[PDB]
Design a binder for this molecule. Structure first.
Ligand SMILES: [Zn+2]
Lengths: 106, 93, 273, 92, 83, 102, 70, 75, 77, 78
């Protein structure tokens, strides 16, 4: 069982997301301090295009996927599902813009 | 010295309320204990509020809000009304 | 309609029919599981709508006991059950519609039973606002007053106390700051066993005393659970000698009879120093 | 009106309550109407209790109030018993 | 003189009476000992505090106010004996 | 006879409930014995681990539960006083039983 | 932005290697595990990223700068 | 008071004999102790009766006392 | 971790508070403390209820069990 | 806003309390009990706030209101 975090794009097991949260998005999402509904709304088990990154700084792939400022690990090219309107508004309150990874937005 | 108690005041209040009723000595002991207990509760809570708010004076507001905390609804309302009335008339006089 | 007590170990729905001199319950699965109840044998006819209940009830309390299957019973109950954020609030509104539908139909049927009796049977309904909680048997239940009876019909075994058959009520365990009390009904027929209602909350004491007075039932209060197995057998042995020596009127002893008090302090309502 | 009780129309002693509030180590300073307010509250509460105690003693055909009647008054009043739920009354 | 095993001075009728005042109709036979133990643990908890007050006042007699303070500390305020 | 186990109250056993049945658990030198219908005998050689739950999260549970796991199933003893937790754990560790604390 | 991130000549190269069917994600996870394990050592795995696509079956793409790293 | 005044006095002295040897008592100390003890026991019997009625019974048993003391928070 | 969702509890708190004084503000820590206290209270109450239910020789907790526990605690009269 | 305390949340609270089976009326009973508790605590807190002449309810008011009830809470500045 593995899920792909919608915001940062990292892929981790769903139980890891529930118990410890997203190591990168915890500053703005509080996934560890969030219930199962919010975890499902921000981490999706349906994804495609597994990506393993070793060096975020110099990898052009990481810059192209906007994951060069995040923790190395499993990443997904495309994630099924989008963030809810309330979570998007909450992120806009923090000043961070959310760019969907669903592929439908380009 | 001559021990202090609220016995004469309870007689006064009783005659004000029930002119044709009397109180036993033990019931007066209970009433004195009750009055002392309530005074202790209210003064302790007033001190707690004053310390909570970094104040060094007990004013009628602290006593009023202590009564608001301690007494239940109707009791608090009537006792607050009585106290404000008495304080207003003492100030006026 | 479901019947209690059931004529078979299997719970089966049936049809209730009104006839010229009584009612007939008839199961669709077996013709032999008919229950016939004559109007002449019904003592009390109760209806109870779903005011808080998952069920609607038509209860027949009988003068003479009937043999339903293997059980002798004074009580025959006919019943049906309703049981099966805005969406959950709307599902409660749909349950409230289903309650009102079954309530209207079963009330109408119980009135039609009363009409078919040619005025032999009055339709009684429980006054829910006058209800109090207590333990007549093994569970805490809401006891409901009616016009002529004190009832509990939701759980088996059923309680049906006719108010006119009561000789005296005794309130046991009533004393200084007590948590709960018991209520005992003694009947005019001393051969009938006394009925206990236990753990009535002490908050309901003054209400129960008022209600007993409004119904013309004498009451007495006691700190101790008096034994009635002893009291009744002595009263059955010689009822005349019992009343000769004061019956229950002397036992009541309402007069406080307290003058000793606890003395008094020097009565002085004067400011000292 | 010499006594402060008279100036406030009270029966309890304003001066004694003032002395106890001062010589009691509660706060550095004390107001002028806090003793008055507290005495008024105390007198009101005692009157409240004595009314029901008189009622209970009159329901038992008794002229003197005893601990029994105080117990009855307290345990029969919803608000007083809530106030005094953790209080034991001797001979009650 | 030392006192030895005076707990049995809480005879069966005292406990039965106390139960009747409490509203109890039928009393199991194991109750009386149960109650006795409970009472012991209560008194030992109250007395240990009363004695603590008495010893702190550098006195040798246990006064009523010591008991009153010990009870007040447990939320057992008692009216009638002072306070 | 009763073993070297002594409760905080210096008692040879502890009050507990097994399902709906209230009773007494005795920690004997070779076995745990519950003396109340149904009677349960558990030899220490057959016990895999003992799991103690003191609230399974927030809020202090005044009474804790002991789950004894063995090769044929588990038995949950409930409603044990929390003061008895340390004496029971130290005794079971002394008998070589694996104690786990959630 | 997104348009500015298009690759240049000086960006690290990408090599694709054929693997057995159904093992592409396994190779990706093994590469990530080796990269994490050899990180901080005298001879770390000098790669930058690696991935695969479900549609492009049998292909594993690794972004690096030297064939010896591959 | 239902308990007497002299067996209770002896019990109180016996219990007090552990904390300090040869301690005197005062006019209203033993009386207050007896009042508090009887009030406490009556409340406990009220709770026990409630539990026993809850169990569909009329007889109070030691496990009802234990449950009452557990819920009260007594050790 | 807290078992109640945060927004429903905040809405409930504001609904209740609006009956004593309009235009009241709550620090987020006040709501957090209230939620911690309420859940701790409810868990202790459920433990007592479970004890009562097991005492009655049952497994299912019932409203009468809750009422009995609250009465024995001294919360309901 | 009292319907926001859903049935699964009460189930979760009972499971952390060790409850194995739950009636159907437990949910309404629990909602009533929680409402009473919260009413008392918020009333005390608002009393503290009004006395402090504030329009915002702080964490100190809640902590003192719980200390008033006897429900002392650690970890919020007490
Ligand atoms: Zn993330």
């Amino acid at each position: 069982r593995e899920r792909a975090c919608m915001l940062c794009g990292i892929v981790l097991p769903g139980r890891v997301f529930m118990q410890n949260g997203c190591p990168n998005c915890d500053s703005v999402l509080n996934l560890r301090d969030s219930d199962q509904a919010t975890v499902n709304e921000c981490t999706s088990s349906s994804f495609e295009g597994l990506v393993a990154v070793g060096d975020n700084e110099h990898s052009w792939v990481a810059k192209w996927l906007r994951v060069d400022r995040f923790q190395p690990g499993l990443y997904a090219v495309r994630v099924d599902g989008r963030l809810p309107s309330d979570i998007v508004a909450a992120l806009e309150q923090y000043g961070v813009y959310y760019r969907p990874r669903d592929g439908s937005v380009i | 010295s001559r021990k202090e108690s609220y016995s004469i005041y309870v007689y006064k209040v009783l005659k004000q309320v029930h002119p044709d009723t009397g109180i036993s000595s033990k019931a007066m002991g209970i009433m004195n204990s009750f009055v002392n207990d309530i005074f202790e509760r209210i003064a302790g809570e007033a001190s707690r509020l004053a310390h909570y708010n970094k104040r060094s004076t007990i004013t009628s507001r602290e006593i009023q809000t202590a009564v608001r905390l301690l007494l239940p609804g109707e009791l608090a309302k009537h006792a607050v009304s009585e106290g404000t009335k008495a304080v207003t008339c003492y100030t006026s006089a | 309609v479901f019947v209690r007590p059931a004529p078979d170990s299997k719970r089966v729905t049936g049809t209730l029919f009104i006839h010229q001199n009584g009612i007939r319950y008839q199961s669709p699965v077996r013709s032999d599981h008919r229950v016939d109840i004559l109007f002449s044998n019904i003592k009390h006819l109760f209806f109870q709508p779903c005011k808080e209940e998952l069920m609607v009830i038509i209860h027949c309390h009988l003068k003479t006991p009937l043999m339903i299957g293997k059980k002798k019973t004074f009580d025959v109950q006919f019943y049906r059950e309703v049981s099966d954020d805005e969406d959950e609030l709307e599902q409660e509104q749909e349950e409230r519609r289903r309650k009102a539908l079954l309530d209207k139909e079963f009330r109408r049927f119980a009135e039609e039973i009363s009409e078919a009796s040619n005025g032999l049977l009055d339709l009684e309904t429980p006054f829910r606002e006058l209800g109090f909680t207590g333990v007549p048997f093994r569970s805490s239940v809401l006891c409901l007053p009616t016009r002529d009876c004190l009832i509990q019909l939701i759980d088996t075994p059923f309680l049906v106390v006719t108010l006119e058959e009561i000789e005296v009520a005794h309130l046991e365990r009533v004393q200084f700051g007590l948590k709960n009390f018991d209520l005992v009904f003694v009947f005019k027929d001393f051969s009938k066993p006394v009925v206990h209602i236990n753990t009535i909350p002490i908050e309901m004491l003054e209400f129960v005393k008022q209600w007993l007075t409004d119904v013309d039932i004498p009451y007495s209060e006691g700190a101790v659970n008096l034994n009635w197995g002893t009291i009744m057998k002595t009263i059955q042995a010689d009822p005349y000698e019992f009343f000769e020596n004061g019956g229950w009127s002397x036992x009541x002893x309402x007069x406080x009879x307290x003058x000793x008090x606890x003395x008094x302090x020097x009565x002085x309502x004067x400011x000292x120093x | 009106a010499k006594t402060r009780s008279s100036r406030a129309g009270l029966q309890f002693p304003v001066g004694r309550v003032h002395r106890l509030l001062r010589k009691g180590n509660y706060s550095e300073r004390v107001g002028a109407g806090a003793p008055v307010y507290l005495a008024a509250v105390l007198e009101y509460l005692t009157a409240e209790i004595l009314e029901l105690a008189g009622n209970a003693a009159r329901d038992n055909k008794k002229t003197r109030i005893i601990p029994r009647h105080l117990q009855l008054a307290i345990r029969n009043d919803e608000e007083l018993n809530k106030l005094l739920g953790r209080v034991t009354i001797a001979q009650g | 003189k030392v006192l030895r095993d005076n707990i049995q001075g809480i005879t069966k009728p005292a406990i039965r009476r106390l139960a009747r005042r409490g509203g109890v109709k039928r009393i199991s036979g194991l109750i009386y000992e149960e109650t006795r133990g409970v009472l012991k643990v209560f008194l030992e908890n109250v007395i240990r505090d009363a004695v603590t007050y008495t010893e702190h006042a550098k006195r040798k007699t246990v006064t009523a106010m010591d008991v009153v303070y010990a009870l007040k500390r447990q939320g057992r305020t008692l009216y009638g004996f002072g306070g | 006879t009763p073993g070297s186990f002594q409760s905080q109250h210096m008692q040879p056993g502890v009050n507990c409930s097994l399902k709906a049945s209230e009773g007494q658990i005795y920690l004997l030198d070779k076995c745990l014995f519950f003396a109340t219908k149904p009677c349960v005998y558990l030899p220490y050689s057959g016990i895999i681990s003992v799991v103690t739950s003191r609230g399974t999260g927030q809020s202090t549970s005044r009474t804790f539960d002991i789950e004894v796991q063995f090769s044929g199933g588990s038995h949950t003893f409930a409603n044990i006083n929390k003061d008895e937790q340390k004496p029971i754990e130290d005794f079971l560790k002394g008998q070589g039983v694996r104690v786990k604390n959630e | 932005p997104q348009r500015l991130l298009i690759p240049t000549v000086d960006d690290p190269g990408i090599w694709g290697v054929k693997v057995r069917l159904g093992k592409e994600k396994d190779v990706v996870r093994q590469i990530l595990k080796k990269k994490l394990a050899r990180e901080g050592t005298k001879n770390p795995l000098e790669i930058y990223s690696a991935f695969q696509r479900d549609s492009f079956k049998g292909h594993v793409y690794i972004e690096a700068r030297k064939a010896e790293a591959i | 008071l239902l308990i007497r005044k002299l067996p209770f006095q002896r019990l109180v002295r016996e219990i007090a004999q552990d904390f300090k040897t040869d301690l005197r008592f005062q006019s209203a100390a033993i009386g207050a102790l007896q009042e508090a003890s009887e009030a406490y026991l009556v409340g406990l019997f009220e709770d026990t009766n409630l539990c026993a009625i809850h169990a569909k019974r009329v007889t109070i048993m030691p496990k009802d006392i234990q449950l009452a003391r557990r819920i009260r928070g007594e050790r």
